[PDB]
From Swiss-Prot, chain B:
<dbReference type="InterPro" id="IPR013512">
    <property type="entry name" value="DXP_reductoisomerase_N"/>
</dbReference>
<dbReference type="Pfam" id="PF02670">
    <property type="entry name" value="DXP_reductoisom"/>
</dbReference>
<dbReference type="InterPro" id="IPR036291">
    <property type="entry name" value="NAD(P)-bd_dom_sf"/>
</dbReference>
<feature type="binding site">
    <location>
        <position position="226"/>
    </location>
    <ligand>
        <name>1-deoxy-D-xylulose 5-phosphate</name>
    </ligand>
</feature>
<keyword id="KW-0521">NADP</keyword>
<dbReference type="GO" id="GO:0070402">
    <property type="term" value="F:NADPH binding"/>
</dbReference>
<feature type="binding site">
    <location>
        <position position="226"/>
    </location>
    <ligand>
        <name>Mn(2+)</name>
    </ligand>
</feature>
<dbReference type="InterPro" id="IPR003821">
    <property type="entry name" value="DXP_reductoisomerase"/>
</dbReference>
<keyword id="KW-0460">Magnesium</keyword>
<feature type="binding site">
    <location>
        <position position="124"/>
    </location>
    <ligand>
        <name>NADPH</name>
    </ligand>
</feature>
<dbReference type="GO" id="GO:0030604">
    <property type="term" value="F:1-deoxy-D-xylulose-5-phosphate reductoisomerase activity"/>
</dbReference>
<feature type="binding site">
    <location>
        <position position="217"/>
    </location>
    <ligand>
        <name>1-deoxy-D-xylulose 5-phosphate</name>
    </ligand>
</feature>
<feature type="binding site">
    <location>
        <position position="11"/>
    </location>
    <ligand>
        <name>NADPH</name>
    </ligand>
</feature>
<feature type="binding site">
    <location>
        <position position="210"/>
    </location>
    <ligand>
        <name>NADPH</name>
    </ligand>
</feature>
<feature type="binding site">
    <location>
        <position position="12"/>
    </location>
    <ligand>
        <name>NADPH</name>
    </ligand>
</feature>
<feature type="binding site">
    <location>
        <position position="222"/>
    </location>
    <ligand>
        <name>1-deoxy-D-xylulose 5-phosphate</name>
    </ligand>
</feature>
<dbReference type="GO" id="GO:0042802">
    <property type="term" value="F:identical protein binding"/>
</dbReference>
Length: 393, 393
């Protein structure tokens, strides 16, 4: 029986993880749920899943949650705040931690699961985008298993040989006959826009979808960040990474082997797939996802990314070579500039341009701990806000 | 250091295997080469690779080889005949047997490697098409490792989980999270021909790469035979097999999992890839095959086979359910009817129709040994010859 702590239970990943649990009650049991301020959805989850613990962001939410759980007869014990969330991530009889709290708030709880030697269903980009070296060192030192839940990394991982899958952070790609990792992305809505029109695209043209990630997919900042992550996670050099546009997103990513073989994972866009794969690894369970119907697909195509069309993708690649200050700064800047584009303060092409300008303006030492990473992030947001103000009168 | 016996060294699979050995001298050494009557090529192969043994079909061929090797100072000892080939397949210090002799002549030498507990690089169809129950029983008893060299099966194999790979025959697909095996094929040159034109196709049109295999691709007999083999090799029921047309042949075949994931192997058409995959398993070597270039591919498409277009594929699926007498008779009838079509004695559509007629005429007790299978084969060829003469005056 796998016992689970779900960090970020009330977002789509958390609900989807719960759907796997709901349909596999003989294999998984929820011990702890952690969320933010969504008391109502947390009530329903505690009543369906009977975890021992639930944690909210603050005392106000925790008190509401307590009152409502109590009204319904629940035995779930209610806590609040960051430490409590780290504590659930490290609980003694927990086997797996779904690490789905995103942003800076996901860093310490994910690191607490790692240092407790858990199996971490990794479902946030900040861990490896901002703290990849810190976190990969902690994984080695603490004997944690990372299992990537993100669609492209989960596909690479399914496509990697068993000795790498079980030894992330140590495994040598080359020694295991791996030539490169083929990280695929859709190329976004402006994949075929003449370059000259990029300057004038609007937030509606760039975006059912998720507006930030949607813009990140238009700039391919999203693949840029996936590139930074994959290199830490899979221990890949620059020459062991290829980024390929694949507009249909049926192939989720691939791995190229020494004999010419390429292994690929394919599927529906439903996150229950990669989530169930990690929960059940090295075995499988039913996820509720429809079997992929190959007779109803668009033709599958591929093309090389053009860095004049996708300067963010190139910027992410160069930031990796500059270290975790640089990838942390790029990520934070990009949150500010995308937000500005979406609020109609700057042009679409000013995302990449101001992302570049913010990195050019910083000169930060390599972070040595999480606090350092938060300090780079805070600083880069400030440099970014000011650049936005320079353009947005 | 892996020591090899190559059964069928002078054909294309044999030459390709030697190309892999040639570029990996630190990993593979040839102990024995077995060929038929091609003395000239066997000389060059013995001279380059210094095997301990060379076996030819007969004493006349063996005497020529011995004279020619003597004149070049070779120490290779020369043998002849079917028993010597079985003895090469069973040698104490051989690890791997490339089983590339095709037809009936390949049955006893493959079975010898299997009864000897060897790693078998399985490169002939008649083994599992005609003797699948016999050979998978002998595999269970000796714990021989089968590694399929044929492109589709090799892809399936690479796409299956590790506990299945390491125990074919005992493996339970369902228990390992596998929903089904996705066997792909091109659909042949008449994939889009109007149905009523089929009756009048000529041999040159069917042969857009042997003429027989070409015709087999056109009728999808080839995929039918592969379907029969895959069921034996992977212990798959009818409901665990799907057959999919994929006209570009870039995907080599796939495996569908319980969580909705599909794993696939892709590559160049070059047989050094699956050969090198089996020789190196569970590691990898360089095979000389260049990396697959995703920016130079046709759009990848898929469609369901239509049994009115391809009645041989349905015949093979049905013959499977009727047992090894049926699949043996089918394969044998097909050698005859295809040869008749190529020699302009029957029409293209008469291949499927006479293949059916031969199976209808046979009253077929289950083979209990290789001699039983050979007797079904011989009798089905006679029934098929007579049916051809019914049509071909
Ligand atoms: C789901 N996921 O992991 C993502 O990274 C989403 C954005 C990506 C994406 C876009 C369109 C799709 F149709 C799809 F499926 C995935 P991209 O970065 O453009 O490849
Ligand atoms: C390579 N191989 O194993 C074969 O069995 C050859 C015939 C097959 C085939 C046909 C055309 C191609 F272009 C190709 F690449 C492979 P099919 O049965 O039609 O899928
Ligand atoms: Mn992703
Ligand atoms: Mn084949």
């Amino acid at each position: 029986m796998k016992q689970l702590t779900i960090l970020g239970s009330t977002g789509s990943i958390g609900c989807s993880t719960l759907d796997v649990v709901r349909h596999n009650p003989e294999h998984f049991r929820v011990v702890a749920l952690v969320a933010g301020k969504n008391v109502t959805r947390m009530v329903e989850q505690c009543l369906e899943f009977s975890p021992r613990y639930a944690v909210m962001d603050d005392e106000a939410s925790a008190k509401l949650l307590k009152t409502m759980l109590q009204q319904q007869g629940s035995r779930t014990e209610v806590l609040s705040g960051q430490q409590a969330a780290c504590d659930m991530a490290a609980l003694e009889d927990v086997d797996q931690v779904m690490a789905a709290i995103v942003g800076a708030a996901g860093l310490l709880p994910t690191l607490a699961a790692i240092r407790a030697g858990k199996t971490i269903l990794l479902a946030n980009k900040e861990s490896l985008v901002t703290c990849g070296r810190l976190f990969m060192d902690a994984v080695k030192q603490s004997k944690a298993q990372l299992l990537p839940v993100d669609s492209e990394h989960n596909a690479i991982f399914q496509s990697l040989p068993q000795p790498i899958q079980h030894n992330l952070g140590y495994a040598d790609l080359e020694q295991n006959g791996v030539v490169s990792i083929l990280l695929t992305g859709s190329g976004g809505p402006f994949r075929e826009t003449p370059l000259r029109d990029l300057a004038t695209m609007t937030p509606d043209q760039a975006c059912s979808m998720g507006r930030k990630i949607s813009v990140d997919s238009a700039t391919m900042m999203n693949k840029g960040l996936e590139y930074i992550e994959a290199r830490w996670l899979f221990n890949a050099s620059a020459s062991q990474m290829e980024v390929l546009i694949h507009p249909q997103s049926v192939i989720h990513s691939m791995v190229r082997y020494q004999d010419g073989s390429v292994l690929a994972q394919l599927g529906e866009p439903d996150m229950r797939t990669p989530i169930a794969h990690t929960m059940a690894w090295p075995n499988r369970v039913n996820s509720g996802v429809k079997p992929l119907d190959f007779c109803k697909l668009s033709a599958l195509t591929f093309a090389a990314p053009d860095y004049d069309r996708y300067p963010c993708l190139k910027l992410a690649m160069e930031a990796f070579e500059q270290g975790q200050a640089a990838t942390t700064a790029l990520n934070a800047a990009n949150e500010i500039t995308v937000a500005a584009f979406l609020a109609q303060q700057i042009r679409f092409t000013d995302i990449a341009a101001l992302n570049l300008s913010v990195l050019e303006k910083m000169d930060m030492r390599e972070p040595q701990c999480v606090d350092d990473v938060l300090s780079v992030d805070a600083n880069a947001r400030e440099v970014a806000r000011k650049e936005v103000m320079r353009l947005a009168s």
